[PDB]
Amino acid sequence: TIRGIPGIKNANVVKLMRHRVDAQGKLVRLDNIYAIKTNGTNIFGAMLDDNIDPYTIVSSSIGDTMELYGIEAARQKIISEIRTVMGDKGPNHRHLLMYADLMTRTGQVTSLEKAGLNAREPSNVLLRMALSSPVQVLTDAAVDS
Amino acid sequence: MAMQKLFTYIYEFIEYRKMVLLEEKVPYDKFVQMVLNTGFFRINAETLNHGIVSVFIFGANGKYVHHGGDMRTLLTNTLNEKKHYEELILIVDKPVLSKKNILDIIVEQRAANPTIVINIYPYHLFCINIPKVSAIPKHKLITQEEAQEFLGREYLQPQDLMQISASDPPVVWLGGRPGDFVQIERPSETAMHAVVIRFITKSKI
Amino acid sequence: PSIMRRLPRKEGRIRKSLLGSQVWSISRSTICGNSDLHLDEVG
Amino acid sequence: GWYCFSWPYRVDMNRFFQFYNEMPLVKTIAHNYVIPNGLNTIVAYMIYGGYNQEDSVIVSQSFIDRGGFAGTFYREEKVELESDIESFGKPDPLITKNLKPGANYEKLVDGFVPVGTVVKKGDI
Amino acid sequence: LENPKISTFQMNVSACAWYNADFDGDQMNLWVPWSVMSRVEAELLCSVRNWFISTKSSGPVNGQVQDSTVGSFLLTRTNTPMGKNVMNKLHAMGLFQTTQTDPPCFANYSPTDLLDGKSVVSMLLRQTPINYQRAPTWYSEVYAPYMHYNKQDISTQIRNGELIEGVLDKKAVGAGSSGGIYHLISRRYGPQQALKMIFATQQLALNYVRNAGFTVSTADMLLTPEAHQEVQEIINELLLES
Amino acid sequence: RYAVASYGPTDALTGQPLDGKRSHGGLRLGEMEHWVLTAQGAMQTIIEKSHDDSDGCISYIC
Amino acid sequence: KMSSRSGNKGIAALALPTSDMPFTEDGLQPDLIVNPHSHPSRMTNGQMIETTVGLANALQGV
Amino acid sequence: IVESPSICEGFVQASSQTLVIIPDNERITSNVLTTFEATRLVAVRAQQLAINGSTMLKKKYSSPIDIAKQELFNRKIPLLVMRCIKVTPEGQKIVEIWNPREMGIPLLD
Amino acid sequence: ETNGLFQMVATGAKGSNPNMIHIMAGIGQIEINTQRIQPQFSFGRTLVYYPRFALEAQAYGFICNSYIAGLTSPEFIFGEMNGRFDLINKALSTSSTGYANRKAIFGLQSCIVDYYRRVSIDTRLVQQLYGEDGLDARQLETVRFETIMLSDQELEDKFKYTGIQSPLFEEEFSRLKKDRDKYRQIFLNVENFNFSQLLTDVRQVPVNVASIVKNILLSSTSGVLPFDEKSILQKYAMVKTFCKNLPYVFINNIQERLQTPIPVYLKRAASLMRMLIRIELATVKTLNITCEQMSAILDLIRLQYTQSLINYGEAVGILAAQSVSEPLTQYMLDSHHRS
Amino acid sequence: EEIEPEENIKRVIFFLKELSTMYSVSPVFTSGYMPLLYDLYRAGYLEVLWNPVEQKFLQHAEQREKEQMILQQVDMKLTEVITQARQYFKI
């Protein structure tokens, strides 16, 4: 590595808007705030940089946020990422919690595929049979009693 | 710049657990010199119940992480000392976590000492004051009696609640053990905040 | 032909006979516009 | 449209022969090689009662009665026999078994319904 | 439908939003419950009034689509190319002869008295008085420099059902318009009451067009020769910069 | 267009109606329609259609 | 289902007698009444130009 | 030595349960019928009226659905709503018994 | 005032501004996957009509003509290149969405709201409370919070009552002020761990408390009430008690009478409703309301609050999967507008 | 274990008691006042709580019951006439 941090290939400069409480308790929108939006994700790489606020690093990766912050921060990351895909003509917020709360109820980010269903609901064979491959599930259920 | 972050946030982690340091602090240059020469740096703290917690910080290119025998003899020599041990925190580089042999010595030492909590953690878990991270909600260990009252009111079992690993970074910083309950106060965009209770499970290593 | 071949795919036992169903007392036709009908009414 | 110039000689399934076709007032080069299919309907681009909303149209009933987009639609029935077992003929109630409920066997003439009669639902 | 020549499932165009349907050739199933248990639950649970408010986006699903959105604009428009947008008593009554609601009282009107579209709309919204004040879709600062907007058409205000000013369009009466007229009626009077007002306001919009007219032509799409020179002069600037 | 009956031709194996208008059978209430009816809570409707009108029977289990 | 040559298909919805259809001052009345809202989103300009050209062809007899 | 299976294990029939009714003052569920519960009550009453027809409704209607709705609205419906709270491993089945004659009906008419 | 095409677009009935521009002014640059027409015709030529390494913008999909003026052969080919993507993505918007929709439902369908308004899988909690508020998506109202954007000086100008010099109203403003701080602190933190999720003083709450006060004031024949010290003090006690017993909406009226302890997670559920009630039923906003009218407001608030609660046994897992997998059709439809 | 409601709810329950013989409403005595609230909401008239104008709604309910009875009797007479005529034509 020469002059950079691993994992990011492009780093742009963007203008973003934030709120801040003034000395008179007024909440004002600050528009002249510059940040860095990178291509590629490395939370720990930007964690070690002295020019970046480590407390307010916003990744787009659920696995990387899960690895370094935990399952509760990964829960908030799933909600944020689905909302970005959903656009603005999207569902109510309570439908995004249902995805994140289901996917993160075991302490690990499970998936919405056959492997994820086998972890959340190992003993529900009939539901597991219907999803992907009844023959494979039925054979395993018989031997496991 | 991992080692510099460790040198401050390991002491922040010790302070956050409400533990009193035993050995006086040293400068950062002396710290890295000891890590280079010996291969590891050792910090001692004592809990309110006088339990001793020893934290080992291992260099990336140290001999203790490449040769399993070195780690075996180090753990054996540390575990037979006249002190009131309760936990050994083994901070190593992240690739060391993927080495099967090192984990084999770790689990063998766990088996040989059923009353001592042996944990191995990567660098990135001690490079920030984890509770102060904005994205991380507020975790708080709750006593057994409060959890029993909550489960009795809700007609619930500990196996029915959501479960969180003991290696989870905020749980590690709290000091939660498997079988304990952690109450999490978290932000919400529907009720402006929410409170959940999770049942701590066994660590992933 | 085998017994276990009847299960897996969309035209299989589970997804065509159990999760889905052929029913009686049902009708299908092309839909049409009618501005004299209420929103909760169907011609 | 005129789906085939030899339609009366053919016994085809699900074929529609529209009687009237017109060359477009604004034709193209594609009509030098194929017969145009359609009519130059007078079209009004207007809101009229809300019955043409959501990609619907309002059609003059008089245009329908005069033959606009009107034609004949054909279906075929191809039935085969088993050699020396089955035969074509009108069954009789007192010998033949499990006749279809609510059927109409009286329209058969030597096993087939004569050409030109109207067959409705339930007729054999 | 007693007509033996009708073979289609006819429904109101404003009901297509539930099914994401249109009339380009779509086919829809229909089964009539016969069991008492299933017939009870159809009336109480599965009635379409229960999904006027979307369970997905928490907003209204139904409204005016493509003829009562532009029809309501013309009805509530302040000025007509033929003067003020008024109508006599005879044509004011003719707007209420299809809504299938109880007719209003026109006894306090001479045959030569003139009624504007705001008054006609008001007589229908008195049944479910609401409070609404937003800017209609008609007003847009993109069109503002090149248009002379009427100051009584860019501010739609309704208090206690009286349309004080402004026009009614996609923002107020359009389908899926959160905070719209029919969203407020549902919150205050019930989703079934909002569906009846969608149909009722649909008829005034359509009955207004019965003699006001609306059409699109080829000349509606044709730039003037002077404006065509301005369009390509703009494009030539883009190709000059390129 | 199609509308059949309260009864008619039946599949030999599953006991369900036949497929489509061509066989004079019933129409399909597929997988996605049981999802919607379950979401709406229409459970007595599912009994009427998927059991009473399709193949519902009585099973005896010791 | 009917369609124009610009791909704007449609379904016959209402059948009005010859005295209920709209008529011009010169007696011309439509055979089909299509919504003006079918155009702006699909931009089938060839259908509108065809009507403009075809309207003059009929009177000119060409 | 874990030996051959015996008769103590291998039972298929689950053991019977004892219905434990929560006392009225210790109930946690709402005192308002849900739309699901109200719909189920009306449907059950309508079907039973289609079977029996014996009702104490003072007014007269020509449909079981209307009679069931008015019975629910007039608080004269002979039904109860049992809300199963929990099935305990020792055998108890803790439930909640609610009377629809003293709960709020969510329906409209 | 007479253009049919413009009135269809300006009023939102049908169409948009790029539609008129394409019809009348010009199509412009054809842009597939946020880039121009790449050269697939023999190493640097986009089509046979343009030379290799062409520099003009027309060779890379820039359509200079409008629909009303007609396109040339190269412009029609580039238009067909973008037009074919719409047909391809429309076909994918069915199959690809169906693959994701079925997998989402089979994972989520087991989630059912139990008698505690929790979301569980047959024993196992997925949510301590459905949506963390226990409400239905069909029973939500969009309501603004006044105190959020106000500075501390104008918070005291508008919500501090100076008519009666009692310590009770000092606590009323303090409770109003620290609810303002709590809302700011939480939702500024939410802004921190998101890309562009800004703070808003507008929430989706089950009861529009301001409308209820406005409705009753209109229907009441009483005008400007005279100053009464006890009535003002009584109303404040009624509002304070109502907010204290507000979490009992989630349990029943039996425990409210018995005043049994409320679980912590239910106290947090009614936090937004407690905050809005104290804003809209502040002493400054209820000066012209009698003590008997105040009872009607409190009775009406908890009537609508209970009506918005989620039903027992509702398959909310299917509801969430249907609500999330449906916008994927439009997301897939716009596949050629993304990198 | 309720004992006694409040004067506002006392007059509201008096209104419901008088309306019971007039509309599909039966008054209960729950502590939480909630079934009463649903009954008033369903009746389409929640204005008793603050506005003492209950008499006009009582008259409204009496009227509506009157037209309901009139329409019911008219329908019964019409259907018996239809039945007798169909019997005549069948014979």
Side-chain angles (χ1 to χ4, degrees):
Chain A
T1 299
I2 304 173
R3 200 199 73 190
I5 63 170
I8 63 170
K9 66 190 292 291
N10 307 308
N12 296 305
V13 174
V14 298
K15 283 183 74 172
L16 59 82
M17 295 181 286
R18 293 288 188 261
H19 283 85
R20 190 176 301 173
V21 174
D22 267 336
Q24 293 82 17
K26 183 175 174 66
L27 194 70
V28 294
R29 294 178 66 250
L30 301 179
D31 298 321
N32 58 339
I33 291 176
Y34 293 100
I36 307 161
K37 186 180 289 293
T38 81
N39 273 352
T41 297
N42 194 3
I43 300 173
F44 184 46
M47 186 181 290
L48 297 174
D49 199 5
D50 194 1
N51 288 316
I52 307 302
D53 195 4
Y55 296 145
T56 295
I57 295 168
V58 188
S59 167
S60 72
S61 182
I62 301 165
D64 192 359
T65 309
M66 171 61 198
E67 182 182 5
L68 282 72
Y69 292 148
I71 195 59
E72 286 289 322
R75 197 192 79 88
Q76 289 292 332
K77 188 51 63 179
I78 298 170
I79 292 166
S80 301
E81 289 301 311
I82 299 172
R83 178 176 56 228
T84 302
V85 166
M86 286 310 121
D88 195 67
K89 188 60 76 173
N92 202 241
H93 196 63
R94 61 196 61 242
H95 309 298
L96 315 184
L97 280 70
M98 276 300 306
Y99 277 62
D101 291 330
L102 182 63
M103 285 174 72
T104 60
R105 74 154 309 270
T106 52
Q108 291 92 32
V109 180
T110 52
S111 61
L112 289 180
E113 276 176 345
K114 176 62 165 65
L117 192 62
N118 199 2
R120 291 184 300 266
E121 294 178 354
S123 62
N124 200 358
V125 181
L126 288 170
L127 169 59
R128 224 164 72 235
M129 293 197 38
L131 172 61
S132 65
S133 68
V135 177
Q136 188 273 330
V137 187
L138 182 65
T139 300
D140 291 331
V143 305
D144 299 350
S145 293
Chain B
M1 185 177 176
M3 300 289 323
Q4 182 62 256
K5 303 298 183 179
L6 273 295
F7 190 74
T8 57
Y9 297 121
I10 193 55
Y11 290 113
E12 289 201 0
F13 168 79
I14 289 169
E15 187 53 59
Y16 176 74
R17 295 176 66 90
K18 296 182 290 294
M19 295 176 326
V20 176
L21 277 176
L22 299 176
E23 184 178 1
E24 294 294 328
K25 292 181 181 179
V26 292
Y28 169 71
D29 287 325
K30 182 63 69 178
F31 163 71
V32 309
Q33 203 270 326
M34 292 180 183
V35 174
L36 184 138
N37 197 348
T38 314
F40 69 96
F41 188 71
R42 186 176 185 270
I43 307 176
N44 302 310
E46 61 88 20
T47 303
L48 276 296
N49 62 6
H50 294 88
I52 308 295
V53 169
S54 296
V55 182
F56 298 178
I57 300 165
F58 289 95
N61 295 317
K63 58 184 181 292
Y64 295 102
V65 305
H66 297 95
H67 315 324
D70 296 334
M71 202 66 108
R72 185 179 296 113
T73 187
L74 184 61
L75 294 179
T76 300
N77 284 122
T78 60
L79 281 168
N80 63 7
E81 193 170 1
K82 183 175 174 66
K83 292 186 286 186
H84 202 272
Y85 280 120
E86 71 173 357
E87 191 176 1
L88 289 160
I89 297 169
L90 301 173
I91 302 170
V92 298
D93 206 3
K94 188 177 74 66
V96 178
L97 295 188
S98 189
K99 289 177 174 68
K100 182 175 174 66
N101 50 8
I102 309 302
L103 310 188
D104 292 331
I105 295 90
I106 295 306
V107 59
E108 281 181 359
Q109 288 306 282
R110 278 172 178 163
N113 298 112
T115 187
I116 290 291
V117 191
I118 301 299
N119 300 122
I120 189 167
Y121 298 121
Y123 289 166
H124 59 73
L125 190 152
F126 294 92
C127 289
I128 298 171
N129 199 339
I130 299 298
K132 285 178 186 174
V133 170
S134 68
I136 287 169
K138 298 294 183 182
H139 298 65
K140 183 177 79 76
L141 289 174
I142 55 169
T143 62
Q144 292 298 126
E145 286 73 340
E146 292 192 329
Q148 287 311 138
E149 287 292 326
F150 168 69
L151 299 174
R153 193 258 177 193
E154 299 270 316
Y155 279 108
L156 280 178
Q157 298 300 118
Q159 287 69 240
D160 297 348
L161 299 172
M162 284 75 75
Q163 64 184 357
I164 188 164
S165 67
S167 67
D168 188 74
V171 183
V172 170
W173 276 67
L174 282 165
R177 309 280 179 250
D180 287 353
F181 298 83
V182 54
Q183 169 176 352
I184 307 165
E185 298 211 0
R186 60 199 195 182
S188 191
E189 308 197 8
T190 52
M192 183 179 72
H193 53 296
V195 167
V196 298
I197 295 176
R198 280 183 174 256
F199 177 70
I200 300 168
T201 59
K202 62 91 176 179
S203 303
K204 56 177 181 289
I205 297 90
Chain C
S2 57
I3 295 296
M4 292 296 102
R5 184 180 294 276
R6 299 180 176 181
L7 271 58
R9 280 84 66 193
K10 184 177 180 180
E11 68 271 10
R13 182 74 63 214
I14 292 175
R15 287 186 55 184
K16 182 181 166 64
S17 299
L18 297 174
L19 300 179
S21 183
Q22 293 279 129
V23 297
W24 299 118
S25 296
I26 195 166
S27 58
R28 180 192 291 157
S29 189
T30 312
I31 49 164
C32 182
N34 197 350
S35 72
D36 282 324
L37 295 170
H38 286 261
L39 281 72
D40 62 350
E41 281 182 350
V42 58
Chain D
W2 304 340
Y3 81 97
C4 186
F5 279 121
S6 70
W7 55 279
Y9 299 93
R10 297 173 61 90
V11 187
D12 291 331
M13 187 71 196
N14 297 321
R15 291 280 91 83
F16 177 72
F17 175 77
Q18 166 174 341
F19 291 151
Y20 293 103
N21 290 318
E22 294 191 4
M23 182 84 51
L25 280 169
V26 184
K27 56 168 280 298
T28 66
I29 198 177
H31 300 114
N32 289 311
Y33 314 111
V34 298
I35 301 299
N37 299 313
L39 297 168
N40 286 304
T41 59
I42 302 296
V43 181
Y45 296 93
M46 65 190 291
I47 294 172
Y48 198 66
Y51 290 97
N52 51 354
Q53 313 195 53
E54 206 54 67
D55 189 74
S56 296
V57 299
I58 297 168
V59 177
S60 182
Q61 179 59 44
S62 295
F63 174 77
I64 289 166
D65 303 340
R66 294 187 181 108
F69 301 126
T72 186
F73 181 86
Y74 289 106
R75 278 166 181 154
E76 80 167 2
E77 276 278 354
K78 181 168 175 174
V79 301
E80 292 206 331
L81 296 177
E82 295 294 328
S83 179
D84 83 9
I85 297 90
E86 293 179 353
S87 66
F88 289 123
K90 183 181 182 299
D92 59 356
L94 73 164
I95 278 165
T96 61
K97 299 297 180 285
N98 65 19
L99 288 79
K100 305 188 191 296
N104 200 5
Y105 286 82
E106 66 182 1
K107 282 185 181 176
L108 295 174
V109 162
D110 194 23
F112 284 153
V113 165
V115 166
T117 62
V118 180
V119 290
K120 64 180 73 174
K121 182 174 73 175
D123 292 24
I124 300 282
Chain E
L1 310 171
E2 303 279 324
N3 199 354
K5 260 147 73 153
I6 302 299
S7 298
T8 52
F9 292 166
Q10 299 179 359
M11 66 181 179
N12 205 343
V13 63
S14 299
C16 291
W18 285 314
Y19 312 99
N20 192 50
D22 52 353
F23 312 128
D24 73 80
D26 296 6
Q27 307 183 59
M28 296 195 54
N29 294 306
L30 195 150
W31 71 92
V32 184
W34 47 270
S35 179
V36 189
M37 288 210 155
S38 175
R39 202 156 67 239
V40 168
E41 186 177 4
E43 297 167 353
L44 299 189
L45 275 185
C46 303
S47 294
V48 297
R49 63 172 170 269
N50 295 320
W51 294 274
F52 172 65
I53 299 295
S54 184
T55 187
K56 161 180 162 293
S57 62
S58 293
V61 180
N62 310 101
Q64 315 307 337
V65 296
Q66 303 175 2
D67 279 341
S68 297
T69 296
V70 70
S72 299
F73 162 69
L74 303 172
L75 169 58
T76 49
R77 182 180 47 179
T78 300
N79 294 118
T80 298
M82 199 84 68
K84 183 175 173 66
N85 197 4
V86 296
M87 64 185 74
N88 52 5
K89 172 181 173 176
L90 183 61
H91 291 87
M93 294 192 295
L95 259 56
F96 285 98
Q97 69 187 8
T98 302
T99 67
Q100 295 174 7
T101 59
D102 64 36
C105 183
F106 289 86
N108 287 314
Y109 289 111
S110 179
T112 58
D113 288 332
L114 296 168
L115 286 82
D116 61 357
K118 297 171 168 64
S119 298
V120 175
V121 167
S122 303
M123 310 172 154
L124 197 64
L125 294 178
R126 293 179 182 177
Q127 307 169 0
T128 66
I130 58 166
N131 291 319
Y132 176 89
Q133 193 176 9
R134 290 197 297 193
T137 312
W138 174 246
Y139 168 77
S140 175
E141 82 178 10
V142 177
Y143 304 146
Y146 322 111
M147 186 182 289
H148 296 289
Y149 273 114
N150 196 350
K151 297 289 286 184
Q152 300 147 57
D153 292 334
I154 59 173
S155 58
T156 299
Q157 180 191 9
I158 302 174
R159 49 190 190 231
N160 288 126
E162 308 304 281
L163 176 73
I164 304 300
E165 55 178 354
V167 307
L168 294 174
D169 54 359
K170 182 189 183 291
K171 197 65 177 173
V173 303
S177 177
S178 297
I181 298 307
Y182 311 124
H183 195 194
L184 296 175
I185 292 171
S186 169
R187 289 289 302 165
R188 275 69 174 174
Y189 294 99
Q192 179 68 49
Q193 189 65 47
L195 292 181
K196 293 187 286 185
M197 208 65 69
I198 291 171
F199 180 84
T201 54
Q202 167 178 354
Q203 304 305 318
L204 280 72
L206 295 174
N207 288 328
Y208 185 85
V209 176
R210 299 291 179 90
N211 48 33
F214 188 82
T215 191
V216 71
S217 61
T218 315
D220 287 342
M221 295 181 286
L222 188 72
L223 296 174
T224 62
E226 293 83 3
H228 174 65
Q229 289 298 317
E230 201 186 337
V231 166
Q232 66 182 357
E233 190 275 331
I234 286 167
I235 298 175
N236 278 320
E237 290 179 354
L238 301 184
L239 294 176
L240 179 62
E241 177 63 32
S242 172
Chain F
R1 72 184 164 130
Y2 190 56
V4 61
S6 178
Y7 63 91
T10 300
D11 188 7
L13 175 47
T14 61
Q16 287 180 4
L18 286 182
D19 292 353
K21 172 165 185 173
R22 65 181 294 276
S23 294
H24 295 282
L27 301 166
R28 179 170 174 82
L29 274 178
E31 205 174 2
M32 289 177 110
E33 286 83 24
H34 288 83
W35 296 342
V36 171
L37 286 174
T38 308
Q40 302 179 1
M43 292 333 283
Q44 294 158 348
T45 309
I46 287 180
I47 295 167
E48 190 208 18
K49 295 312 291 180
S50 278
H51 292 80
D52 290 0
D53 272 327
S54 186
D55 52 352
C57 60
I58 292 282
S59 187
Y60 295 99
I61 297 169
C62 178
Chain G
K1 202 190 294 189
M2 293 181 287
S3 170
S4 62
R5 281 188 294 170
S6 293
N8 262 320
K9 59 189 183 298
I11 287 290
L14 186 66
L16 294 172
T18 189
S19 56
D20 290 339
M21 294 294 276
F23 58 101
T24 62
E25 183 178 1
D26 308 275
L28 185 70
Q29 63 180 4
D31 301 354
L32 308 179
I33 299 175
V34 299
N35 216 18
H37 295 70
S38 61
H39 187 274
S41 66
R42 282 87 63 85
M43 288 177 283
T44 53
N45 294 107
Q47 168 171 353
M48 309 296 283
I49 300 168
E50 175 193 12
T51 306
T52 297
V53 177
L55 188 58
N57 290 344
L59 297 176
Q60 200 175 2
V62 299
Chain H
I1 297 169
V2 176
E3 293 179 353
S4 296
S6 58
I7 308 165
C8 65
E9 65 183 1
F11 286 117
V12 176
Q13 183 184 329
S15 296
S16 298
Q17 294 168 353
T18 314
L19 194 72
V20 174
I21 293 171
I22 292 178
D24 293 336
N25 290 318
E26 294 180 354
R27 294 185 290 189
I28 289 298
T29 53
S30 62
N31 59 329
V32 174
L33 285 160
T34 63
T35 55
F36 294 146
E37 288 168 351
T39 296
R40 174 69 171 167
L41 286 173
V42 172
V44 163
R45 186 54 189 157
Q47 183 65 53
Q48 290 179 356
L49 284 163
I51 296 172
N52 200 359
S54 178
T55 181
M56 42 167 46
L57 205 60
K58 293 182 183 293
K59 300 295 187 291
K60 300 295 187 291
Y61 309 80
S62 66
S63 179
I65 306 176
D66 280 354
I67 300 175
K69 290 177 69 67
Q70 303 298 313
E71 277 204 331
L72 182 73
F73 295 154
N74 285 295
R75 322 191 162 283
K76 292 177 71 68
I77 181 160
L79 298 170
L80 295 180
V81 183
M82 183 187 79
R83 292 173 172 168
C84 296
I85 295 300
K86 184 183 173 59
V87 177
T88 302
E90 66 182 1
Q92 305 177 330
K93 182 176 173 66
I94 296 90
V95 299
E96 289 217 25
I97 302 287
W98 279 96
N99 189 0
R101 277 83 55 90
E102 64 184 1
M103 293 185 286
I105 297 90
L107 306 173
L108 60 84
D109 198 277
Chain I
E1 215 163 6
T2 67
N3 207 22
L5 174 72
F6 180 72
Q7 283 170 350
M8 271 179 284
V9 166
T11 63
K14 179 65 72 178
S16 66
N17 272 318
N19 285 318
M20 293 185 287
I21 297 172
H22 285 42
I23 288 164
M24 293 170 81
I27 296 170
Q29 179 66 52
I30 292 292
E31 191 176 359
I32 301 167
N33 289 315
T34 62
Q35 65 190 1
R36 306 194 294 167
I37 299 296
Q38 300 295 107
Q40 292 84 18
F41 186 84
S42 83
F43 174 54
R45 317 182 66 199
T46 53
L47 283 178
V48 70
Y49 305 113
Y50 301 108
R52 190 174 279 119
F53 313 123
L55 282 167
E56 65 183 1
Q58 288 86 358
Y60 296 98
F62 185 70
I63 300 181
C64 301
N65 293 306
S66 49
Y67 288 123
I68 195 66
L71 309 191
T72 63
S73 297
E75 295 173 357
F76 190 79
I77 296 159
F78 292 144
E80 276 291 346
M81 286 180 183
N82 198 3
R84 184 64 57 92
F85 269 64
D86 294 331
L87 302 182
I88 287 169
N89 292 131
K90 179 67 184 72
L92 293 174
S93 72
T94 307
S95 64
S96 296
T97 303
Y99 284 123
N101 194 4
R102 191 179 184 275
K103 286 187 282 190
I105 295 170
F106 273 92
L108 280 151
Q109 72 184 16
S110 300
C111 303
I112 294 146
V113 172
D114 55 358
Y115 291 112
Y116 285 87
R117 279 75 179 271
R118 309 187 300 241
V119 189
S120 64
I121 300 179
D122 184 22
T123 60
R124 293 186 299 276
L125 260 59
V126 169
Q127 282 181 347
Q128 190 77 51
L129 196 67
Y130 172 66
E132 291 161 353
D133 56 19
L135 309 169
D136 196 356
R138 300 177 297 176
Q139 300 283 333
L140 296 181
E141 181 65 26
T142 301
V143 167
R144 182 178 181 270
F145 292 167
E146 286 199 359
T147 53
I148 303 307
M149 293 303 183
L150 292 180
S151 76
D152 58 0
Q153 178 53 246
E154 52 197 355
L155 182 65
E156 190 275 331
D157 277 333
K158 296 184 180 183
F159 286 97
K160 182 84 172 68
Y161 182 60
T162 60
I164 300 171
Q165 297 294 321
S166 181
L168 277 297
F169 299 111
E170 306 165 39
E171 313 193 320
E172 163 178 352
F173 179 71
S174 295
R175 181 66 177 171
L176 273 165
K177 182 174 72 175
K178 75 179 180 182
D179 278 4
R180 199 266 304 261
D181 296 338
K182 193 75 174 178
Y183 189 106
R184 282 179 170 176
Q185 165 189 1
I186 286 165
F187 284 105
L188 287 177
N189 190 9
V190 172
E191 201 174 11
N192 278 335
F193 57 80
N194 277 306
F195 281 159
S196 65
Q197 189 67 29
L198 308 190
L199 188 144
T200 61
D201 74 346
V202 160
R203 296 279 107 196
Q204 274 177 347
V205 296
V207 179
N208 194 350
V209 181
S211 77
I212 295 171
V213 177
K214 182 172 173 63
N215 189 359
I216 283 182
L217 274 169
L218 182 69
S219 76
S220 73
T221 184
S222 301
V224 176
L225 299 195
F227 171 71
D228 188 5
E229 179 176 357
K230 280 187 282 186
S231 312
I232 294 166
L233 289 175
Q234 181 185 1
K235 279 182 284 186
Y236 170 60
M238 293 177 70
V239 173
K240 178 198 281 186
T241 304
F242 182 79
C243 293
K244 190 255 292 175
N245 297 318
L246 190 62
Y248 287 111
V249 175
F250 295 101
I251 309 168
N252 50 3
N253 64 353
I254 302 168
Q255 306 303 317
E256 183 174 358
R257 187 188 69 243
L258 293 178
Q259 295 299 317
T260 56
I262 306 169
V264 170
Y265 72 98
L266 291 184
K267 295 179 186 181
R268 309 286 190 265
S271 55
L272 272 185
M273 278 322 282
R274 276 174 171 174
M275 193 183 166
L276 182 62
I277 286 167
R278 283 194 292 267
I279 292 174
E280 295 297 326
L281 281 72
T283 305
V284 302
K285 289 187 173 181
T286 57
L287 282 182
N288 290 324
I289 289 177
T290 69
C291 298
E292 192 165 354
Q293 290 172 2
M294 178 52 73
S295 301
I297 298 169
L298 300 178
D299 285 336
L300 262 172
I301 283 166
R302 81 166 182 264
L303 170 70
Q304 298 192 9
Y305 195 22
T306 297
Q307 284 179 350
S308 53
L309 292 177
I310 192 71
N311 285 328
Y312 298 145
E314 183 143 17
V316 290
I318 296 173
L319 297 184
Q322 288 170 348
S323 306
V324 169
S325 299
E326 202 276 331
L328 288 182
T329 312
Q330 188 58 48
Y331 190 80
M332 171 86 240
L333 270 177
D334 292 331
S335 178
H336 49 295
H337 309 165
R338 293 188 300 273
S339 182
Chain J
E1 296 179 356
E2 49 86 20
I3 191 66
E4 190 253 345
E6 195 51 39
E7 291 194 357
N8 204 351
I9 299 303
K10 280 169 70 175
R11 68 168 287 273
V12 174
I13 204 76
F14 181 76
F15 170 77
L16 278 193
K17 193 184 296 293
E18 189 161 354
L19 183 63
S20 66
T21 69
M22 295 174 70
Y23 188 55
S24 65
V25 164
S26 181
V28 297
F29 282 159
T30 47
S31 58
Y33 295 161
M34 202 58 195
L36 182 147
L37 292 175
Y38 287 100
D39 287 333
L40 263 67
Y41 177 78
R42 186 273 306 279
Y45 184 77
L46 278 156
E47 199 175 1
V48 177
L49 299 171
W50 71 86
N51 216 359
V53 296
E54 69 275 16
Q55 282 188 357
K56 69 180 179 67
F57 188 48
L58 279 175
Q59 294 180 357
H60 180 274
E62 184 178 1
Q63 172 166 352
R64 157 185 73 211
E65 188 197 9
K66 278 187 175 183
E67 289 89 7
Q68 179 48 250
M69 294 182 286
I70 292 296
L71 188 152
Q72 191 190 14
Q73 279 210 309
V74 164
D75 190 21
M76 302 187 147
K77 294 181 176 66
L78 188 152
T79 184
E80 67 181 1
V81 169
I82 302 299
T83 306
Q84 200 156 266
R86 295 188 201 278
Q87 286 291 342
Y88 281 172
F89 184 78
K90 172 187 164 186
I91 287 165

